Design a protein around this ligand. Sequence first.
Ligand SMILES: [Zn+2]
Lengths: 21, 30
Amino acid sequence: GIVEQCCASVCSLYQLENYCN
Amino acid sequence: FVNQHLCGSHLVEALYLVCGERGFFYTPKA
Ligand SMILES: [Zn+2]
């Protein structure tokens, strides 16, 4: 999930965009 | 864009910014 990808680890902008509607 | 850990309200604010008119989903149990 997003917490594991972007908080516990680090997300690129592209990875953040996987959580857009 | 920053390259760092984004957590909690900071993660939500980043999604709000990045996603723009599309909107986003914040589902932290996922
Ligand atoms: Zn803070």
